[PDB]
Subunit: 233 residues, 6 copies
């Protein structure tokens, strides 16, 4: 009995899920786990079950964009997911400090989408679970990988025009660290459906992927998923 | 030197483009053509040059959702596309009149997204080009396929909640025909970058509570229109 | 039994109606038809029945402004009108291309009013019926009159101040052709009440009437009304 | 050299102006005066110089609706008017207390228009000048005409629909007295251009569900106030 | 039986109430009346009953800020207050004309708060009662004290940042006289609960207290309260 | 040279500040410390330097409400504060789970104010610093005090009306724990001025329909956290 977009079953959904933008990235992640079980591939949603450090968790892709990743997150949350960690890339809003290849672990986001607003009034915060943020940070410490922490702007516009000015400059003076396209949506949906969420991002651009740094980030994401998967096993 | 997301080059972009959501649909479309050439497949964006009735145009996937599809449309418009037609599925907002399997060709859309709003004020209409619309309707007549016309609601929310009421009921009473997730964004981006746009949709569901020959028909109409439109660019 | 503002009866309303801003313009239009029947004149609303090319249709005035023309359109739509075509003047938002005296046939509009927003959420498009737009364009071809096509900004402000900046510059970079004060309102009301609407405008100003060009525009409007009136006779 | 819409010249504008919606009302008002002079009639704008109690002031029509009347008010304010009083009709939002034929003199209005918002932020109040208000009320006392005071809702929507609920019910509970279509716009334009404004209204209807002597009385009060106010401009 | 924040009883509330920002100011006001009766002091809300010119009225403090003064005004209005006059300080938005120490009597305000908007749609005017404004002005005439009249901007921001621009410049070109932080809130709450309100302010700053001028302002406020208290005695 | 409202000087501001609403609460807190020094009392702002566990930090009152408390937070942040913890009371929005007397330590807030919006766009989150949050939670563990975590609604409206429905019901369904009037403003101001913030609240009421030892416990936790945090500033 299958989920409309993900095309996996309720009983295939693990408590912990690592989510990812590029479907290609699922393939490159499962290959560094102890083993894996391919589950489904429909549209941009590729589902693979990972086995790492004695634990098991899904890794699922959602494509680019809040509306498309919302479908993913809703299907996960309405069907037994308890923890969802986003691993992806972003641009830097503090180019003096946060540089290409740097890793950012985020605790909150700017809701520059539409879905979240159709779900709850705009005054509501897009904010992550602390345990998840704490686990991610602690893993980065163990693995001896320096990270930044901060707020991400989650904006549905990648390409600005010359008519309405972009708000990236504002949000950067407001001390937002980075910009991507999915994190706020995950956070709001998670809060609404009692799922614990978090975000780890690698800087790939300076709108204002370094091979070994990407490998570190993935180690952190996977470690954190395994650490949190323990509490549910 | 390649487009950041689509991973094709400016020269590979034909004047007319057919756009679809599901990357799987690109492969089902290309075999209905006379011949084709695979160009690229990056993330949710699969690119293929189609050859139909002596004409040559791309077919490109954009995934689900306004933000993800805006990246596709922008890369296309900034690099030479002149006509972009969306072909996809949708839900009925008129379940007494418009039923699972029916085809709707839309002239305008409700902007229930965000990208379009980060680009111009919300008071600005999401409209399609009337030639594209007219071409689509005329193909539907030549191929003897009955077809609805109307307005689509393009909403970023597929799965509603119990706190903020959905606006579908509202837009239904306002005579919006049909609901999906991409058309408004296409239209506004097309208008701002001087690209003619249009959309054709097959009803796959009824959110109030795919037919193979009808899907085949819709693809036929879409491909027919693309060819007719490619004709006027030598 | 009379309509509250128009002061005509249900049975006096024809399927096709040409609407116009200046009440004076009704008088100048009826005089170039084959014959006419004056119906009423209340406030700014002058109603005259026209007979042209074997067809009959109302021609009605509504004054300047969205709130006042809404009353007109609502009384028409709630009482049997099936097609309403707006004929009027506008300013140009592309002064290099669209010049004083030029004719523009419009398919959609910017909803810079209030009525439409009190009727339906702002995300809803103000857009015309294609058959109407097609008929208008085809008439312009027959009569050998070159026209432009495009989006009109319908704005309730004619006179800007120096505090809030006008959006005309924005909407012009957005590729809007022209600016007037009624078209979006007609379009939204029409869509809401299953009436087919359209707009033909003559450029009279460059905010950013050429005697023979006005005569052409009126020929087009009247031809189009007669062509569409046929389908209902 | 004439005003674009009103078709009168700057010199023809008197310090005090009486404004009305119906162009037909201008003609009914001028004959109640001592004498008058027709000035112009263009579109919905009819202009007449009135002479009442040794005083001289214009009476001008503006049609229905905020956008159409804003053009009138702006042309007047930009060219020398100092006081503008609106006299017109309205509906009751307090049908137990305020009944068909009653007269209301309003100090402030709800801005349910658009023009005012394209001119300043919505947080800005639509208020009248208190002298004008006071003069109107004092005339009502001298002429022994009972009168209500309160806030008017100025709404661009006369004919509501079944999709977006009207806000009249709301504003009624908020103690707004009365409803019409022009006052808010007058007030805001007056405030921005340093012109003193006021309004007096006769109730012609009850949108929840014209009395000749009451209308005569209201016009008397309006003309009385205009004369008293024209007095202080030599 | 006591009010939740003010900690006074229904029967202690007089028909007329003078309200004030600084709790310290209550102490300095009661001392220039004929006599007084201290009632309560809870949080920032100090309540004292004043006896002046044969009349009696409360004088109550509410602190700085719309949210905090709303609590005060609601407790007063829901418990028998009929007239509430605000006496306080403000900055000047017309620095050429309205100078430090000048007195302004206000009839309306810009609703740059949140409470009023949670109570009623933003299109609703924040406007005072005329009798109150008239009384205040007439007292200023008797006492031979020159005053200004105008609209006050009531804004919840005292300290602007460099990201979103302040609207004070706009509201000043719009001909607003002064800026403070409570008046619009009083006016809206008053209108909603059939209480007559008014405002008298002394200019203390030029964001864009003169000892004898403050004394004048207080004389005016007190006179006006006594004059209005008569109608209810 | 003194701060305009707080009436203390830049040098008197310690890196860590404890903030409370009720000026009366400052006096009840200082006596629970090892020693203290009164600094100032102006309007609703009472300032006192506290000494607890060898550490030194201010305690300052800010009255009720976002606008009044923003003045306090801004004066503190502009003049050297590094950590600001809010300790106060609140209502339950989860009355089956969170009961009168329970303590909630909040990580984030709903921005139902205005100040925060005049400072940055509403899409920006009101979040606390996670160290502050973590410190507070750890103190609660050391002192063996059970404690809730969650999101607070910070609303400028204490007394709702019958015209515009309150949004508490909504935010409750959205899993907001608790409701008060200051936290969102603190958080946003902290984020914009690079100051770490947090909040701890005791439930005093149930707006759907103070326990002394629980209040004592909450103050203990707050003071404990302040000391632990002051430690890292020599
Ligand atoms: O500089 C950027 N701006 C906006 N999005 C992204 C991204 C992420 N990558 C995808 C689009 O490039 C999308 O998933 C977004 O979240 C990386 N860098 C940037
Ligand atoms: O009933 C519907 N609601 C919203 N979207 C869709 C669609 C289309 N399919 C995809 C998601 O189901 C998306 O691209 C959307 O445009 C088909 N039916 C519906
Ligand atoms: O340049 C213009 N700006 C705004 N409206 C108009 C108009 C039209 N004429 C009337 C006001 O001048 C009104 O009906 C509007 O629709 C002509 N030119 C312009
Ligand atoms: O009940 C009413 N609702 C809205 N407007 C009006 C009016 C006035 N009459 C005109 C339209 O009926 C218009 O100028 C408006 O201001 C009288 N009664 C009502
Ligand atoms: O220049 C000013 N701007 C904003 N508020 C005030 C005030 C008033 N004083 C208090 C804050 O300084 C507050 O009650 C506000 O209403 C005096 N001057 C100004
Ligand atoms: O149930 C409540 N709603 C709103 N505020 C509060 C408070 C706090 N107490 C003060 C007002 O009662 C204010 O500072 C607010 O933050 C306790 N309980 C509630």
């Amino acid at each position: 009995n299958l989920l409309r977009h993900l095309k996996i079953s309720k009983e295939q959904i693990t408590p912990v899920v690592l989510v990812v933008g590029d479907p290609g990235r699922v393939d490159k992640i499962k290959v560094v786990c102890d083993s894996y079980v391919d589950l489904a591939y429909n549209r941009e949603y590729k589902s693979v079950e990972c086995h790492y450090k004695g634990q098991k968790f899904l890794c699922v892709s959602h494509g680019i964009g809040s509306a498309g990743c919302a479908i993913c997150f809703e299907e996960l949350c309405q069907n037994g997911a308890k923890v969802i960690i986003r691993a992806g890339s972003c641009g830097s809003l503090q180019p003096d400090l946060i540089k290409r290849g740097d890793i950012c672990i985020c605790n909150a986001a700017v809701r520059e989408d539409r879905v979240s607003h159709l779900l709850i009034h705009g005054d509501f915060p897009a904010v992550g679970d602390f345990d998840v943020y704490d686990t991610l940070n602690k893993c980065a410490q163990e693995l001896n990988v320096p990270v930044f922490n901060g707020i991400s702007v989650s904006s549905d516009m990648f390409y600005p025009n010359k008519i309405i000015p972009s708000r990236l400059e504002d949000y950067s003076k407001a001390n937002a660290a980075v910009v991507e396209m999915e994190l706020a949506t995950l956070m709001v949906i998670g809060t609404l459906r009692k799922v614990k969420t978090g975000g780890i991002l690698i800087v790939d651009g300076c709108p204002f992927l370094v091979p070994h740094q990407l490998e570190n980030m993935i180690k952190i994401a996977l470690g954190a998923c395994a650490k949190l998967a323990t509490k549910y096993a």
